[PDB]
Design a protein around this ligand. Structure first.
Ligand code: NAP
Ligand code: 30L
Length: 316
């Protein structure tokens, strides 16, 4: 299986990347250094993760060391919700570029379809706890993203957490100049996303699967929650293939023609998670893993469920 997938901007994207949400700032520099040393060439970042400076230190040190050339790296970041206004998009991108110590991003995503009021707070709230929306609409934010391509700041633009009607809205934008290259969505055996994936792929949009291990370190995890890494049925598939459960969970989206971005700050796991190019799940394995779907979604914000662009009211 080829290690990169061709995007609709003509560039190739590594199908395995390193996630960085929740990677502590005092550990993420070493995590990214180790990842690059063991073969990762794609890093998934975001301004809201509050660790792009430290990610950037690692990237810059490996470029300076000539462990890797810039053209071999595929660096992704995301425009946070408080920067959807057209006049804020460029500065938000520039802050990410400055922090990552780069002069372009390979891919820049609208992080969520919901725009929030600009200001210092990433989740501006009213006095009852609802997020304060922006009166920005995704189409104007998209035009601002297109301008980043034309200014040389980013090679590709895309979207994240867009439902199929929101994807369709952009694809139907009057005067659309660049199609989204990627839609990055939650996807794993408990949230298999068949409908949304088929739609995006049929339009030439590459899907990236986030939280492929079920995000066991998410801050709102409960003790009774489903656990992919502990599911005996998945452990059994892993044992049959002489692989770890995490390796099965990473290989699964790869065989659906998805990109996948498991997060770790543990050096041994960073290396383990990359050793997924030397085995194949059978069709039966794939269909069996798909059968575990329960529509169990771990990444959503209750504060956003009344936002006009909240993405998860729709079936898909
Ligand atoms: N676009 C979006 O809205 C969005 C939302 C969520 C996530 N994402 C992206 O997707 C990335 C991945 O998702 P995620 O961080 O939610 O969770 P994840 O990758 O599903 O799971 C990460 C957790 O799994 C553990 N882990 C990693 N490899 C393991 C292994 N081999 N064995 C056992 N445990 C292992 C990690 O522990 P250690 O780190 O302690 O090793 C960490 O607790 C994020 O970091 C972020 O880059 C994007
Ligand atoms: O959004 C991510 O990539 C991961 O989740 C977060 C990471 C952060 F650093 C900070 C916050 C979140 C978070 O709450 N993310 C969830 C979220 C955000 C925005 C809008 C919605 N929504 O449902 O409309 C949901």
């Amino acid at each position: 299986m080829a290690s990169r997938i061709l995007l609709n901007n003509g560039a190739k994207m590594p199908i395995l990347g390193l996630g960085t949400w929740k990677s502590p700032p005092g550990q993420v520099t070493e995590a990214v250094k180790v990842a690059i040393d063991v073969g990762y060439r794609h890093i998934d970042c975001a301004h809201v993760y509050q660790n792009e400076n430290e990610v950037g230190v690692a990237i810059q040190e490996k470029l300076r060391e000539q462990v890797v050339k810039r053209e071999e790296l595929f660096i992704v970041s995301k425009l946070w919700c408080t920067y959807h206004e057209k006049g804020l998009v460029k500065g938000a991108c520039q802050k990410t570029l400055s922090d990552l110590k780069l002069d372009y991003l390979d891919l820049y995503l609208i992080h969520w379809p919901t725009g929030f009021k600009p200001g210092k707070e990433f989740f501006p709230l009213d006095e009852s706890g609802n997020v304060v929306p922006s009166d920005t609409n995704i189409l104007d934010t998209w035009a601002a993203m297109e301008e980043l391509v034309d200014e040389g700041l980013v090679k590709a633009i895309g979207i994240s957490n867009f439902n199929h009607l929101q994807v369709e809205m952009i694809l139907n934008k009057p005067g659309l100049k660049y199609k989204p290259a990627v839609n990055q969505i939650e996807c794993h055996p408990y949230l298999t996303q068949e409908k949304l994936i088929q739609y995006c792929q049929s339009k030439g949009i590459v899907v990236t699967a986030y939280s492929p291990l079920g995000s066991p370190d998410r801050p709102w995890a409960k003790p009774e929650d489903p656990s992919l890494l502990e599911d005996p049925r998945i452990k059994a598939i892993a044992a049959k293939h002489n692989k770890t459960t995490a390796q099965v969970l990473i290989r699964f989206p790869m065989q659906r023609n998805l990109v996948v971005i498991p997060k770790s700050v543990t050096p041994e796991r960073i290396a383990e998670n990359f050793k997924v190019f030397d085995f194949e799940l059978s069709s039966q394995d794939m269909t069996t893993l798909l059968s575990y779907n329960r529509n169990w979604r771990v990444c959503a914000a209750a504060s956003c469920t009344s936002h006009k662009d909240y993405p998860f009211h729709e079936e898909f």
